[PDB]
């Protein structure tokens, strides 16, 4: 008891995950008093309760972020934590379209005189 697997958590929604988090936190709070009052094999249980709380928090955060990404899928401005990280310099880099933009005179020259494929007889 106290070991909650991620597989069962990935199918729950927010309310039962919150309820499970509440019960796990209550058991850990009682078990700390049990630790300071007596010694036993319940230290394994407190370790599993800590890791189960971590798993539940991870799953709740992941589902909330997935829902938010779905909500912000078709919007121009995203929250800064939902924006891709990359590096600061990569984010300041010119976009691919803007870097590939050429002048129209250049475009006419490239349309009518591109680099050709050729060979020279020996």
């Amino acid at each position: 008891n106290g070991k909650v697997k991620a597989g069962q958590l990935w199918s729950k929604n927010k309310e039962e995950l919150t309820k499970i988090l509440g019960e796990l936190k209550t058991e850990l709070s009682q078990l700390r008093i049990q630790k300071i009052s007596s010694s036993g094999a319940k230290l394994n249980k407190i370790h599993d309760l800590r890791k189960s709380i971590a798993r539940v928090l991870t799953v709740i955060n992941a589902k909330q972020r997935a829902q938010l990404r779905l909500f912000y899928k078709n919007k121009k401005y995203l929250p800064l934590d939902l924006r891709p990280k990359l590096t600061r310099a990569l984010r300041r880099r010119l976009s691919k379209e803007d870097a590939s933009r050429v002048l129209e005179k250049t475009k006419k020259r490239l349309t009518h005189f591109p680099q050709r494929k050729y060979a020279v007889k020996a």
């Binding site: 936190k25 209550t26 850990l28 709070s29 700390r32 008093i33 630790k35 300071i36 009052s37 955060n61 909330q64 972020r65 938010l68 919007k75 121009k76 401005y77 995203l78 929250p79 800064l80 934590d81 939902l82």
Partner: protein
């Protein structure tokens, strides 16, 4: 004018940093605390240093 942002800067609000399970750590089992229990109707707890 007050701010009316086109996007929230933080997508998810933080959970409360100091909830009750973090505030109360464990009761004190020392002989002074055990004296205080029946002498003063007082319980002694070890708590978080940032809790008022």
């Amino acid at each position: 004018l007050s701010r009316a942002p086109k996007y929230p800067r933080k997508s998810i609000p933080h959970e409360p940093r100091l909830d009750e399970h973090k505030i109360i750590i464990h009761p004190l089992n020392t002989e002074g605390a055990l004296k205080k229990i029946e002498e003063q109707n007082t319980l002694v707890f070890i708590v978080d240093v940032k809790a008022n």
